[PDB]
Amino acid sequence: VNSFSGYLKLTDNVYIKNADIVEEAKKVKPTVVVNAANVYLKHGGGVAGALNKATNNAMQVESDDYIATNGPLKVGGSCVLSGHNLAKHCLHVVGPNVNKGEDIQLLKSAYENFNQHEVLLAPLLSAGIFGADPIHSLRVCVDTVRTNVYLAVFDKNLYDKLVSSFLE
Numbered sequence: 001v002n003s004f005s006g007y008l009k010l011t012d013n014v015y016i017k018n019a020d021i022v023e024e025a026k027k028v029k030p031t032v033v034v035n036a037a038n039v040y041l042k043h044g045g046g047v048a049g050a051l052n053k054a055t056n057n058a059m060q061v062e063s064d065d066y067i068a069t070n071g072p073l074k075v076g077g078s079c080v081l082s083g084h085n086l087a088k089h090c091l092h093v094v095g096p097n098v099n100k101g102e103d104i105q106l107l108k109s110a111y112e113n114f115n116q117h118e119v120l121l122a123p124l125l126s127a128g129i130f131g132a133d134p135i136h137s138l139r140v141c142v143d144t145v146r147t148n149v150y151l152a153v154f155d156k157n158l159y160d161k162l163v164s165s166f167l168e
């Protein structure tokens with residue numbers, strides 16, 4: 001039903017909230033939740049682990065079936081699969097892992113995938129275990145995404161830093 005509440009409006013199409021993306025998905029029942037995926041859709045840690053656990057591993061079983069027949073994604077690419085109990089659809093998006101030396105320039109390609117969907121619940125791509133600067137990821141989101149994006153950031157200190165930096 002896409003009933004988003006409690007978000008700051010950063011721009012005409014980008015919103016942010018200090019919240020667990022899993023709890024937001026259960027409250028909002030969005031058309032699309034974004035997963036911060038890797039190319040073989042191994043949902044072990046960070047956002048991907050939280051989402052998969054909240055589906056009681058249904059996301060991992062579906063992802064394994066997709067990989068078996070289609071092979072891995074490319075960095076910057078995406079894949080629509082079922083959203084299980086969290087959303088109608090899950091958009092699995094692969095941002096660059098800069099900790100593994102992947103090219104940060106592909107973060108724009110990663111966010112471009114959002115433009116195929118009118119409204120998304122999403123995390124900050126490539127932040128967290130992927131090692132990108134969270135402020136940079138928010139700027140690439142704001143500069144690249146034209147559709148309505150509701151960002152959920154769990155950590156209060158990171159959220160307050162992001163909002164402070166954006167509002168300079």
Ligand SMILES: Nc1ncnc2c1ncn2[C@@H]1O[C@H](COP(=O)(O)O)[C@@H](O)[C@H]1O
Nearest residue numbers: 020021036046047123127128129153154
């Ligand atoms: N459950 C969660 N809900 C919301 N944001 C999260 C959650 N877990 C991690 N994050 C943030 O989401 C972004 C992507 O994290 P990661 O999945 O580690 O690449 C980073 O800004 C993390 O701080």
